[PDB]
């Protein structure tokens, strides 16, 4: 529940128009703003009044209201659209505090699958004169968001020290993420090679390091 | 052309009092417009917080009124937040906007600074290079980095070479390991042509526990 409420997820197909609707009491004497937030960077402005959009967005977004609805618009949408799109105006009541809607998150279907870049690092002189190893295996450029990362040392699979994010978006709308491989000295030294492997979409890539 | 930039402690103890500032440039903070307030959780929506036009005239959010005082500093030319009996929930990125005086909207937005409520206490980060070698090197083309590890709490600022090195470096989310601290790396894709010449450093920075460090990475 809130105040100018908004669909929590929709989807559009590439190059396809869709339609973002926020509804509140407050809309009625109110023109709702529009803005666009991709992830880790601060909101953008797109939409407000009445169909007015900033110097720089461009002219596939526009903006409607009728009643106590608005509605931001994205006509053929592209890959640099899929983001998290947020409702505000100010409320009617007392001294008219601004008020969000719960944003939206704007899935664009349809973009080209993209494999793992891995890159695995061994432990560092430094760490290991700290009586300290860890592994580091960076995972970027990869879509769909989705990655499965085994550990093993040698040929056997390892579970234990191993730590890996989620998903994140990078600019170019793929998705990185980082496994992190926590071992003593001695057992990075007593054994021949660690290996790093992430499958996506069925597929596996595998990077192997090795004390020397 | 107006540009916000946020400033803040980063770590707050429970019940204590959140203090931020907004430095302004382009634009006189004595002004009509609307200067603001705005924060974000973890993963959540963004919410409101308050607004101050004139250098007098506040507004804030109701679930907020009694802990907020939004003031501005005129000499300096810039505006201020304190957030008052803090808990977990206030834990947000905080940013700094303008909304003019008529449709109301915030045009212009700070780059945001991070929050975080907690009793735990501060942990500077250990800094070790990420050595490129033939392991790391395809082609032409070698990876080399930067391992930023055991620190409390978010965030941790990576640049390469004082900025002047942008160009393929991957900085990736920080892991929120078992024991409670933060670990991340930050990668740079070099010509591996380069190694021998060019000399990369990243500079790690973590105010909250006054960890600046610039790491030289050279091959062993």
């Known amino acids: 529940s809130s105040e100018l409420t908004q669909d929590p997820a929709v989807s559009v197909a590439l190059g396809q128009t869709v339609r973002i609707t926020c509804q509140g009491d407050?809309?009625?004497?109110?023109?709702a703003s529009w803005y666009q937030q991709k992830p880790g960077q601060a909101p953008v402005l797109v939409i407000y009044?009445?169909?007015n959009r900033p110097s720089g967005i461009p002219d596939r977004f526009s903006g409607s209201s009728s009643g106590n609805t608005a509605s931001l618009t994205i006509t053929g949408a592209q890959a640099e659209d899929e983001a998290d799109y947020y409702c505000?105006?100010?409320?009617?009541?007392?001294?008219?505090?601004?008020?969000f809607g719960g944003g939206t998150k704007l899935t664009v279907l349809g973009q080209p699958k993209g494999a793992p870049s891995v890159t695995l690092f061994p432990p560092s002189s430094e760490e290991l004169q700290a009586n300290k190893a860890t592994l580091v295996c960076l995972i970027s450029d990869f879509y769909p968001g989705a990655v499965t990362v085994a550990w093993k040392a040698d040929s056997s699979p390892v579970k234990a020290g191993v730590e890996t994010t989620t998903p994140s978006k990078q600019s170019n709308n793929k998705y990185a993420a980082s496994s992190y491989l926590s071992l003593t000295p001695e057992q990075w030294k007593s054994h021949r090679s660690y290996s790093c492997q992430v499958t996506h979409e069925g597929s596996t890539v595998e990077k192997t390091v090795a004390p020397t | 052309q107006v540009q916000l930039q946020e400033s803040g402690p980063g770590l707050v103890k429970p019940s204590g009092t959140l203090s931020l500032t907004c430095a302004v440039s382009?634009?006189?903070?004595?002004?009509?417009?609307?200067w603001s307030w705005v924060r974000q959780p973890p993963g959540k929506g963004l919410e409101w917080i308050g607004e101050?036009?004139?250098?007098?005239?506040?507004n804030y959010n109701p679930s907020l009124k009694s802990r907020v005082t939004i003031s501005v500093d005129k000499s300096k030319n810039q505006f201020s937040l304190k957030l008052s009996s803090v808990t977990a929930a206030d834990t947000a990125v905080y940013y700094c906007?303008?909304?003019?005086?008529?449709?109301?909207?915030?045009?212009?937005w700070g780059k945001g600074t991070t929050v975080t409520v907690s009793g735990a206490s501060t942990k500077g980060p250990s800094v070790f290079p990420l050595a490129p070698s033939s392991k790391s090197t395809s082609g032409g083309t070698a990876a080399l980095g930067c391992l930023v590890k055991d620190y409390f709490p978010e965030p941790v600022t990576v640049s390469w070479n004082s900025g002047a090195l942008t160009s393929g470096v991957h900085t990736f989310p920080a892991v929120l390991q078992s024991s409670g601290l933060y670990s991340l790396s930050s990668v740079v894709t070099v010509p591996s042509s380069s190694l021998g010449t060019q000399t990369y450093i990243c500079n790690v920075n973590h105010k909250p526990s006054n960890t600046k460090v610039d790491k030289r990475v050279e091959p062993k």
């Open positions: 009044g009445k169909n």
């Open positions: 101050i036009s004139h250098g007098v005239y506040t």
């Open positions: 906007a303008r909304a003019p005086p008529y449709y109301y909207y915030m045009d212009v």
């Open positions: 505000n105006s100010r409320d009617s009541s007392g001294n008219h505090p601004v008020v």
């Open positions: 382009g634009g006189s903070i004595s002004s009509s417009n609307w």
């Open positions: 407050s809309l009625r004497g109110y023109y």
